[PDB]
Each structure stands twice: as C-alpha cells, then as structure tokens.
Design a protein around this ligand. Structure first.
Ligand code: 1SX
Ligand code: ZN
Length: 204
C-alpha cells in the first residue's frame, strides 16, 4: 500500500516546503480560536506519500482535466488539514466526506496559507482540540497537515457564498473569496504529496 519517504532537512525540497509553510502564516479573523496562537511552526518531520493506486488515479484525472483546460493542469501546491489524514494517505481524498459546512458548497477544501489548514487539524472550528489536553492552541501535541498537488484545471471565481455540489460547467474547481479558498469536487484532483508533522510554537 502506501509508502512514506522521509525527507532530510538538508534536501532543498524539505527547505522549500518548510519555507512555504513558515512564510504563509497569517492572522485569522477568529483571533486564533480554531488553530491557536503562533508566528512560527516547529517542523518535526516531512514525509513524501508514495501510493501506486493513488498516483494512478491522480494521473488519470489529471489527463482528463488537461484536455478541457487547453492542455494545462493548472496544478498548485496547497494545504489541507483534517483529523483523518491517516485515512487520506491510505485511501486518498473522498468527496463523499466533503466539508458539508463549507462556504462554497460540499467539496474538498484547500488553502494557500498553512495557518488556514491548521485550523482544521482537530476538526471543524478546531473541534475540542487535541485528544490529551482538549486545547486547540496546544504547543505540545504533534499535528499533521498535507501539502498537496492540486489539479485546479479551469477555476471558477466565486465572490459569494453559495452551495455548489460540483464545479460550474466547463470548470474543474472553485476559487472562493478574506483570502481565497480552493475547492475541488472530485477526490482524484488532489494528491497528498507531503505529510508534515509539526507543532505550533508559542510566541516569545
Ligand atoms: C473530516 C472533517 C472533520 C468532516 C473535515 C471537514 C473539513 C475539512 C477541511 O476542509 N479542511 C481544510 N484544510 N484546509 C482547508 N480546509 C477548509 C478551509 S481551507 C477537513 C476535515
Ligand atoms: Zn495537547
């Protein structure tokens, strides 16, 4: 099944992913309620997910999208957080477990900003936080999030909240607008490329 490759801190690839993660921390409108308070992550581990069934399904989808998007994937690296990352890296994304409460409909959601996704690591609104301390801003418990290859194909820009079950005709994804949220409606338009294990760090 799924094989995890551990990246070394010396690898440029490691240093790019951590750079994307550290440099996209923002202040969120809920004052850090869901995701905690921090200016930095402490990155513990970065692992590359290798799964043959999933790579195959991703590629397949990727080709269909290319055809309808002038032979462009429009692939982006985006974050995703969920308390079921473990099911994700073994069975892929599953739109049947879509974010029912999502602003732009029932799809699978991704962020440019790591701090956005981190808000969903323990559940929606941050849930009741970590299992041990029930603390959404815990600094001890290890969190995991995904930095994913996401096939956006042709994106539809939505500036209003609106329940969508699927992308608009001729489109493969929705970009919704504070900051943009990227939504896909098919699980195979995302591959969980990097599994990041980390902590949020208490500001000094
Ligand atoms: C399994 C349950 C708890 C239903 C679930 C529901 C929604 C999400 C999710 O959408 N997470 C996420 N990661 N990055 C972003 N988001 C949404 C904003 S941008 C993850 C898990
Ligand atoms: Zn904890």
């Amino acid at each position: 099944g799924t094989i995890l490759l551990d990246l070394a801190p010396e690898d440029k690839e490691y240093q790019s992913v951590e750079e994307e993660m550290q440099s996209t921390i923002r202040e969120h409108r809920d004052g850090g309620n869901a995701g905690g308070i921090f200016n930095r992550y402490n990155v513990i581990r970065i692992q590359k997910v290798v799964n043959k069934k999933l790579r195959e399904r991703f590629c397949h989808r990727q080709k269909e999208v290319s055809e309808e998007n002038h032979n462009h994937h429009n692939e982006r690296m985006l974050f995703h957080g969920s308390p079921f990352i473990n099911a994700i890296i073994h069975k892929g994304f599953d739109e049947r477990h879509a974010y029912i409460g999502g602003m732009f409909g029932a799809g699978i959601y991704f962020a440019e900003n790591s701090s956005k996704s981190n808000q969903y690591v323990y559940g929606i609104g941050g849930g009741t936080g970590c299992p041990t301390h029930k603390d959404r801003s815990c600094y001890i418990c290890h969190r995991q999030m995904l930095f994913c290859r996401v096939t956006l194909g042709k994106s539809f820009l939505q500036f209003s909240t609106i329940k969508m079950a699927h992308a608009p005709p001729g489109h493969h994804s929705v970009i919704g607008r504070a900051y943009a949220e990227y939504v896909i409606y098919r699980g195979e338009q995302a591959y969980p490329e990097y599994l990041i294990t980390y902590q949020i760090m208490k500001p000094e």
